[PDB]
Amino acid sequence: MITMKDIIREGNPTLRAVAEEVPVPITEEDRQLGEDMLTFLKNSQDPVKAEELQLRGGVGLAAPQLDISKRIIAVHVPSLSTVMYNPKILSHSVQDVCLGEGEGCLSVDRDVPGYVVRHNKITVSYFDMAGEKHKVRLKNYEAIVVQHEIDHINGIMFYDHINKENPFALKEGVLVIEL
Ligand SMILES: CCCCC[C@H](CC(=O)NO)C(=O)N[C@H](C(=O)N1CCC[C@H]1CO)C(C)C
Numbered sequence: 001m002i003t004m005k006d007i008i009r010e011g012n013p014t015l016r017a018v019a020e021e022v023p024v025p026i027t028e029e030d031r032q033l034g035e036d037m038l039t040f041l042k043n044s045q046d047p048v049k050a051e052e053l054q055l056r057g058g059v060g061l062a063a064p065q066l067d068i069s070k071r072i073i074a075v076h077v078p079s080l081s082t083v084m085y086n087p088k089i090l091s092h093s094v095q096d097v098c099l100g101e102g103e104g105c106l107s108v109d110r111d112v113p114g115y116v117v118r119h120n121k122i123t124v125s126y127f128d129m130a131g132e133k134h135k136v137r138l139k140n141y142e143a144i145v146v147q148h149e150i151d152h153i154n155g156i157m158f159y160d161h162i163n164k165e166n167p168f169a170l171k172e173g174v175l176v177i178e179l
């Protein structure tokens, strides 16, 4: 089962590499990995299990974070709960958005203050565990989570987006989500 022991941290080069496309039809191993990833997210959100297993809560996870350089992401937003294989953003809004409390990441063991501005709306295509294609329109928090995970498969970390000089600057027009 995935626990914090399996999640690599900032400094590990795999987090900055570009993940490899996975085969379609989906391999049984990639299917299994996806299942284990979703199970981790659910476990991390269960107050009791999170304590038992000493897990940090998370709403998304990308294969590279497990030192598996593959384009596989799992999301469990408290809704949206699924595993996306070879996900790609086909289009996005002009309008941007950011979480008022900033972002964190299971691979980052330090607090990095500041706004992470992303697109408020995105259209994403992906293959599910059965290798069947889906095209979904996401927005707000769900869009933020998916962009955070897709960034991982492109070797990008949330803090790469922070304006170090002015971390809480808010360009006129950007939306804010407060959880
Ligand atoms: C919103 C963008 C998606 C964040 C995904 C991460 C999980 C992760 O490491 N993904 O790669 C998470 O849950 N992080 C948490 C997080 O940043 N959260 C949880 C509630 C919303 C937001 C607050 O900043 C903290 C607990 C580390």
Ligand code: NI
Residues within 6 Å of the ligand: 104, 105, 106, 107, 148, 152
């Ligand atoms: Ni992360």
